[PDB]
Amino acid sequence: TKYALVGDVGGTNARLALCDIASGEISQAKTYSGLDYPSLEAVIRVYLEEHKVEVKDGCIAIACPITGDWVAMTNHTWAFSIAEMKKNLGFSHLEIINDFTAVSMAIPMLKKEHLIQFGGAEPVEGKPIAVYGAGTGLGVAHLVHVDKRWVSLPGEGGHVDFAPNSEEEAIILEILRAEIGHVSAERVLSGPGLVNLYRAIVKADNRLPENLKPKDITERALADSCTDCRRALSLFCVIMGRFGGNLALNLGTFGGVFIAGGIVPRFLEFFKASGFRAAFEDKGRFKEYVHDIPVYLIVHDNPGLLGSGAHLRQTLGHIL
């Protein structure tokens, strides 16, 4: 039984792949729309019959809290019982994990080409790792090396309070608080949050935001067509740095801080020139605590899939 099933579901998209159990290598990736199938189980059935593979074991990352046996997505209508699904497909193992648990578990598998460093020096081996990423949501997980085991620590850290550093970011906080209630980091660091930032800068200035999508703000910011857009993106990069630096301090993250691509590669050279690193380190006397911690942009295309394979293989008894 050479392959296990691996997957990465985020709102409407479900990508399934094969992981070679011996090497952890990913192959035969294929994507489906969630709108076209009534459940994750149905798309797995289709994927498996459609290639011609027999699997016993699988691991699927989902972009929502995995809190127990019943999983209900927020950004799509799928809702399912893990145990019910494992039974129905006849698997021996069926791990459902959070998407950032999966991304954290890809970290040990990542090599230099997959990483772009933004500041700091070198990781201190065996020391904790933080991973986060702004996409549809703000994801955060942590990773620690205990013995020979990579231990991911999943959370919902994208939902902590947003911490403004300026009178300006504070007016933005007020505006968003006036309109929604609790303002989380996710409210500003994500696709939707980039748009929240734009609307709020424009609104702070008593003007009327146009109905822009995240790709629009990014598009105009890079093109220089919109100073509001460029301000939104600039602030986003700054809040991004501060947020990651907070994670570095909170768990003593000398093994490094990882950003899981998401929206960021869409604007790599803008990010590269931004205040990101300097926001990362802007921690008063604690600048020196975080100053040598490296940040890496993860640029693998499918870290969720890789991470799912890694998580499974460790569960299967393998050492990475």
Ligand X SMILES: OC[C@H]1O[C@@H](O)[C@H](O)[C@@H](O)[C@@H]1O
Q: Which residue has the tokens 């990101």?
A: 276
Rounded to 5 degrees, φ, ψ at 46 are -60, -40
Residue 317 partner contact from a second copy, ligand X, none using kind-dependent CB cut-offs of 5 to 8 Å = none
In this complex, which beta carbon is closest to ligand X, that of residue 14 or of residue 226? 14
Size of the site for ligand X (CB under 6 A): 15
The correct pick among 82, 249, 299, 320 for binding a second copy (CB under 8 A) is 249
Among 8, 57, 95, 99, contact with ligand X (rule: CB under 6 A): 99
- Of 24, 34, 119, 135, the one binding ligand X by CB under 6 A: 135
Residues 6 or more apart from 54 whose CB is under 8 A from it?
Answer: 1
Whose tokens are 């940040």? That residue is 295
Task: Determine, following the binding rule CB under 8 A, whether residue 284 of this chain makes contact with a second copy.
Answer: yes
CB of 45 to a second copy, least distance (A): 31
Based on the shown chain and the rule CB under 8 A, indicate whether residue 319 belongs to the binding site for a second copy. no
Q: What is the per-residue binding string for a second copy in 162-181, x denoting contact by CB under 8 A? A: xxxxxx--x--xx--x--xx
Residue 221: CB atoms within 10 A of its CB come to: 24
Nearer to a second copy, 168 or 216 (CB): 168
Q: Kindly tell me the sign of the dihedral angle through the C-alpha atoms of 176, 178, 179, 180.
A: positive
> Furthest-apart CA pair in the chain: how many Å?
63
**36-75 positions binding ligand X, by CB under 6 A:** 63-65
Specify the residue, 21 or 290, whose C-beta has the smaller distance to ligand X.
Answer: 290
Which residues of the shown chain bind ligand X in the complex (CB under 6 A)? 10, 63-65, 98-100, 135-139, 156, 158, 186
Which residues of the shown chain bind a second copy in the complex (CB under 8 A)? 65, 67, 128, 140, 142, 144, 146-147, 149, 151, 153-157, 159-167, 170, 173-174, 177, 180-184, 242, 245-247, 249-253, 282-284, 286, 289
